[PDB]
Design a protein around this ligand. Structure first.
Ligand SMILES: [Mg+2]
Ligand SMILES: [Mg+2]
Ligand SMILES: [Mg+2]
Ligand SMILES: [Mg+2]
Ligand SMILES: [Mg+2]
Ligand SMILES: [Mg+2]
Ligand SMILES: [Mg+2]
Ligand SMILES: [Mg+2]
Ligand SMILES: [Mg+2]
Ligand SMILES: [Mg+2]
Ligand SMILES: [Mg+2]
Ligand SMILES: [Mg+2]
Ligand SMILES: [Mg+2]
Ligand SMILES: [Mg+2]
Ligand SMILES: [Mg+2]
Ligand SMILES: [Mg+2]
Ligand SMILES: [Mg+2]
Ligand SMILES: [Mg+2]
Ligand SMILES: [Mg+2]
Ligand SMILES: [Mg+2]
Ligand SMILES: [Zn+2]
Lengths: 97, 25, 129, 96, 117, 87, 206, 217, 62
RNA sequence: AGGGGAUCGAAGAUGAUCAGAUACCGUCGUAGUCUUAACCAUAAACUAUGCCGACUAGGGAUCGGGUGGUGUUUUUUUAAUGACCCACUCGGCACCUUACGAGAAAUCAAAGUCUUUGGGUUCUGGGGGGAGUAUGGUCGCAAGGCUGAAACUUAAAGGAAUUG
């Protein structure tokens, strides 16, 4: 029996889409699919901004952030527990955690 | 065996019977 | 495309008599429907219906009164010998006691008990109970 | 809908598609292709009288274990070789 | 750790219900009550029960704890639940109406003082 | 259900619903018996004399058991201006 | 039927606009559209409070007829009407059910709350669904107060109100309480109001 | 000695209800099996099947028997009971009750001429209990119950003199066969024939008539 | 699979069962007489029962 | 066949891993991967769900069109236009809930209106193997496509869900 009403993920009224590549696996998953997390962070991280904002000139200055957008595969999403196997009822939830 | 290497097998088995056949034209 | 007219009609009546509804619209109003509604009205399986003039094909509103189990149509309008009428009412009617398989003879669209009595036959139209 | 056509003028399409499908029906094909008159070791006939060749002690299938006692027979009317089973206890000793 | 069992807590919900006047906040006296209105087959259970009934009392007489009801509390809560002010219905300056609610009355048969909001 | 000598057989005659005329089955345990009392010389509801409407499990699961009441109340005059035949 | 005293009298109608029961939910529902007179701009709805009262009297009329007024279960789980169905229970026979309904009531006899009413009245069908479901297994008519987005399922006569708080639920409970008393009972001469304060059917906390 | 705990049950031990169809008229959920015990004794019982089933526990296995019983007379009243439990004896007992707590009213009738005592059914009816769908057809006199020996004996207590049957589905699962041969005859009271077209005024429900003698203490 | 087994022992069990002669006895009636004889037996006099009536039990339970 | 030939990379090599390791991992790389002009006609080419039609139930989003709106926000003065809001109506990609109904069930707004069995119409399937085999035919430069048996064989094969 069908174990997902979305089959894979969100195509519907198409039948094909471009493929993305995993950043870990280097797999080929259809872009419609793919677990997809946005990775923003900080150049200096939390612990170093003290010795950073000390030793740096400029009046305080505007901390930059590294912007990256991670696409995963179900394979590598599940193992690295980005996503995790839930119950038959629980799986249905599309709401962010 | 998997039915895709079973499919493979029946093609080698046919390419090989085209051979033994026309061994006498 | 539309292929029977009587069909969508008698289906709307059938469907709506299930959902509890007491009225129903019909498209489009064709003579054949009407006589079929005339058969049904007299034996008390609907109420009064009302034609509607849209200079086009027509609409009907029919009042429902419970006591309608099914109003079927039989397609294609088979040729029915006058003896073979028994073998239809046997098939698609619930008991010998009541029920009606309205035909369509050259004497006119009518129920089978009527044709039973006039001694005429023809092409089965549908059926009501 | 109901897949099939319901037209009053379509008996042709109906009578032939049923013919064009009786062929998936096993024991109908065997009758129309006369397998019985062809590849069957008898003729189609209920019985055939052959000559007894060698005798066979055929082992039984799983999960049983015994010696089934049979005969290889040369049916007179075809010359077809056919192995046949002898029933009851010791009857193998009645045939030679 | 120490989690008292139902056979205990069952017995505390019962003595408190059946004997709220005669229970008290002290552990010692209840222990003696228990050897009167109850037949407890072992001293410990006798003590353990009375301990729990007495625990409830130190939070009964400080709030109407969840699943227990006896007389003098039920009669206590029936009174308190009859407060009636000089009312708020009233109106201290006519009926404040938005609109169409006004038209609701105009088309109904009714007087009533109004306002437009 | 009559018979030979005009005699009445068949255990009972089942109730018919007042919003669909469709029989109330023996085990139609979602069906309802609505008893509405009358009013004599100003107020003073009469015990013993009711306006009893019957409803079936179907109509009440569908949700028309209200619209059907208000309609069937104005029918024998018990309401005014509520049910509007025309929509 | 019901003469002319049972019409409006805007002292009753004063209670309604005062309890705010006229204000109707935004999310309507198809089985509740007649009760909607109009919808105020800035996203609001306005109940046709006449019908509310009209059904109300119809409501009371059903509460009578049934003999033993005790086993006419008035129920609520919402706190806002709990104190109200207690005061109603007090006046009329009316066995009350406040708090949790505890499944197994109307069906399943062994239980410690096996009521066998012949009529049921409910505050909010959403939150009281379990009463309404369970009723439907035992042929028990159901009265209930209904805003606009409330499940008409498995209910019969519905009184249209607000059940969003404030005074809506008590009033309609207080009013029900009044006319169940005018009819038969011990009120008579309905021309005068009631010796009983309204603000008694309400909430607590305090 | 019986002691009733439901309103329905009090009225019947009283004598305030004399017949069964009084309950069927008012759709009264019979809960105490004593009611039909008394509203119709002489009611005959037949056990039809006692088949075993199984289960695995948090260790090994689990096994128990399953009783299927029909109860009825032959004057329109029948019920079906299935209950599986630890023993064969307790199974039979527990189910008979279950069958009786659900006895049904049968609308018999005529196939053609109404010439004295109904013999067959009102109309065609047809039940379904997954896959297996049983459908009963009226039958001329002297015909008989044409059905499976199982359904025969079930219509035998139902009280049918002649009927034809058309079993579809996996009739071998005996359970779901009967249930739909049940679902069939019980349906008979739901087919709006024109005889019943004529309206009655709706009775009053003995729960409000004897409403005094109805409630508890 | 394998097809020349050991014919050496066909007729084994029959040729080694102790022969027994049939104990003679007066013939049973034939025709109606038997079927009559059957009729009065199975349900006229009634012999051994268990609530269920048992046709061919030997030494019974006792 | 011509171009192209970064890249990644069937073959192949080479490093490790292993008991073996033709493999997974790592390195080098042929073909291919791009295009032109030819062919090829196959994918789980999937929604594993034919098409036109009629009907049976609610709910909020969202795309395209239109309509209504002394709604909003925009200038230098609050008008045109622009976006935005509300309601709405057709035609969309769906979702949500229900369940009258349907199903072996998982489940479906169709997979509903089917033993109360007929709106029109195309196609396929009739136990598992043998086997998409043999053979004839035909298309293809080829690989292959399309059509497509039988003898013999066997009592399960198989779905859904339940507990372990
Ligand atoms: Mg996909
Ligand atoms: Mg695709
Ligand atoms: Mg494959
Ligand atoms: Mg291959
Ligand atoms: Mg075969
Ligand atoms: Mg040999
Ligand atoms: Mg089937
Ligand atoms: Mg390699
Ligand atoms: Mg290799
Ligand atoms: Mg070429
Ligand atoms: Mg190709
Ligand atoms: Mg293909
Ligand atoms: Mg395919
Ligand atoms: Mg919809
Ligand atoms: Mg779209
Ligand atoms: Mg190749
Ligand atoms: Mg075997
Ligand atoms: Mg498969
Ligand atoms: Mg499986
Ligand atoms: Mg499992
Ligand atoms: Zn990956």
């Amino acid at each position: 029996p069908k174990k997902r009403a979305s089959n894979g993920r969100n195509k519907k009224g198409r039948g094909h889409v471009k493929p993305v590549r995993c950043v870990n696996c280097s797999k080929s998953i259809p872009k419609d699919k793919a677990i997809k997390r946005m990775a923003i962070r900080n150049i200096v991280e939390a612990a170093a901004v003290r010795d950073l904002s000390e030793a740096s000139v400029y009046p305080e200055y505007a901390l930059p952030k590294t912007y990256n957008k991670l696409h995963y595969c179900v394979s590598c999403a599940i193992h690295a527990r980005i996503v995790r196997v839930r119950s038959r009822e629980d799986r249905k939830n599309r709401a962010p955690p | 065996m998997r039915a895709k290497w079973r499919k493979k097998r029946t093609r080698r088995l046919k390419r090989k019977r085209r051979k033994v056949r026309a061994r006498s034209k | 495309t539309r292929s029977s007219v009587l069909a969508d009609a008698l289906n709307a009546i059938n469907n709506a008599e299930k959902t509890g509804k007491r009225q129903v619209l019909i498209r489009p109003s064709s003579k054949v429907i009407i006589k079929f509604l005339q058969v049904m009205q007299k034996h008390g399986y609907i109420g009064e219906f009302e034609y509607i003039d849209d200079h086009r094909s027509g609409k009907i509103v029919v009042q429902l009164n419970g006591r309608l189990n099914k109003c079927g149509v039989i397609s294609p309008r088979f040729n029915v010998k006058i003896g073979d009428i028994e073998k239809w009412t046997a098939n698609l009617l619930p008991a010998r006691q009541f029920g009606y398989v309205i035909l369509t003879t050259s004497a006119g669209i009518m129920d089978h008990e009527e044709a039973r009595r006039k001694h005429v036959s023809g092409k089965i139209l549908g059926f009501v109970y | 809908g109901k897949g099939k056509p319901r037209g009053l003028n379509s008996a042709r399409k109906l009578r032939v598609h049923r013919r064009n499908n009786r062929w998936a029906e096993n024991n109908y094909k065997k009758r129309l292709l006369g397998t019985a008159f062809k590849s069957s070791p008898f003729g189609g006939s209920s019985h055939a009288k052959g000559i007894v060749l060698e005798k066979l002690g055929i082992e039984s299938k799983q999960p049983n274990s015994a010696i089934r006692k049979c005969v290889r027979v040369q049916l007179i009317k075809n010359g077809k070789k056919v192995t046949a089973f002898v029933p009851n206890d010791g009857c193998l000793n009645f045939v030679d | 750790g120490r989690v008292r069992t139902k056979t205990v807590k069952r017995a505390s919900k019962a003595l408190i219900e059946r004997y709220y006047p005669k229970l008290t906040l002290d552990f010692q006296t209840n222990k003696r009550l228990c050897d009167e209105i109850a037949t407890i087959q072992s001293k410990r259970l006798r003590n353990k029960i009375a301990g729990y009934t007495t625990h409830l009392m130190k939070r009964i007489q400080k709030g109407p704890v969840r699943g227990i009801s006896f007389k003098l509390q039920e009669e206590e809560r029936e009174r308190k639940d009859q407060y009636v002010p000089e009312v708020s219905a009233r109106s201290n300056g006519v009926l404040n109406v938005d609109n169409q609610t006004s038209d609701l009355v105009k088309s109904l048969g009714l007087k009533l003082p109004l306002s437009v909001i | 259900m009559e018979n030979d000598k005009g005699q009445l057989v068949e255990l009972y005659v089942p109730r018919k619903c007042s919003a669909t005329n469709r029989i109330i089955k023996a085990d139609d345990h979602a069906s309802v018996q609505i008893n509405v009392a009358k009013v004599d010389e100003e107020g003073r509801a009469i015990p013993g004399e009711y306006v009893t409407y019957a409803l079936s499990g179907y109509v009440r699961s569908r949700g028309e058991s209200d619209d059907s009441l208000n309609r069937l109340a104005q029918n024998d005059g018990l309401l005014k201006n509520v049910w509007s035949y025309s929509r | 039927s019901l003469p002319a005293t049972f019409d409006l009298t805007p002292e009753d109608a004063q209670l309604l606009l005062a309890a705010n029961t006229h204000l109707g939910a935004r999310n309507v529902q198809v089985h509740q559209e007649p009760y909607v007179f109009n919808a105020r701009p800035d996203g609001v709805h306005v109940i046709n409070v006449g019908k509310t009262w009209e059904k109300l009297v119809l409501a009371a009329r059903i509460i009578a007829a049934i003999p033993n007024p005790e086993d006419v279960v008035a129920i609520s789980s919402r706190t806002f009407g709990q104190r109200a169905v207690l005061k109603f229970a007090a006046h009329t026979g009316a066995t009350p059910i406040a708090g949790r309904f505890t499944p197994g009531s109307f069906t399943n006899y062994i239980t410690r709350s096996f009521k066998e009413p012949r009529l049921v009245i409910v505050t909010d069908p959403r939150s009281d669904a379990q009463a309404i479901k369970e009723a439907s297994y035992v042929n028990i008519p159901v009265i209930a107060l209904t805003d606009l987005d409330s499940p008409s399922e498995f209910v019969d006569v519905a009184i249209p109100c607000n059940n969003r708080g404030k005074h809506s639920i008590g009033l309609i409970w207080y009013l029900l309480a009044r006319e169940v008393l005018r009819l038969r009972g011990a009120l008579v001469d309905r021309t005068q109001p009631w010796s009983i304060m309204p603000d008694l059917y309400f909430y607590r906390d305090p | 000695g019986w002691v009733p705990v439901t309103k329905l049950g009090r009225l019947v031990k009283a004598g305030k209800i004399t017949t069964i169809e009084e309950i069927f008229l008012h759709s009264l959920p019979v809960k105490e099996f004593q009611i039909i015990d008394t509203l119709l004794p002489g009611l005959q019982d037949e056990v039809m099947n006692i088949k075993p089933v199984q289960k695995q526990t948090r260790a090994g296995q689990r096994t128990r028997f399953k009783a299927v019983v029909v109860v009825g007379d032959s004057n329109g009243h029948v019920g079906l009971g299935i209950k599986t439990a630890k023993e064969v004896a307790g199974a039979i007992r527990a189910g008979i009750i279950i069958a009786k707590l659900s006895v049904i009213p049968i609308r018999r009738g005529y196939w053609g001429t109404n010439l004295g005592q109904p013999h067959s059914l009102a109309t065609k009816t047809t039940g379904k209990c997954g896959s297996v769908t049983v459908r009963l057809i009226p039958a001329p006199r002297g015909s008989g119950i044409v059905a499976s020996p199982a359904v025969k004996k079930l219509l035998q207590l139902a009280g049918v003199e002649d009927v034809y049957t058309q079993s579809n589905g996996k009739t071998r699962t005996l359970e779901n066969t009967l249930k739909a041969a049940f679902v069939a005859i019980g349906n008979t009271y739901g087919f709006l024939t024109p005889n019943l077209w004529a309206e009655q005024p709706l009775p009053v429900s003995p729960l409000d008539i004897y409403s005094d003698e109805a409630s508890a203490q | 699979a394998k097809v020349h087994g050991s014919l050496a022992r066909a007729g084994k069990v029959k040729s080694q069962t102790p022969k027994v002669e049939k104990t003679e006895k007066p013939k049973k009636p034939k025709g109606r007489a038997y079927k009559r004889l059957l009729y009065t037996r199975r349900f006229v006099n009634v012999t051994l029962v268990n609530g269920k009536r048992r046709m061919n039990p030997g030494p019974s339970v006792q």
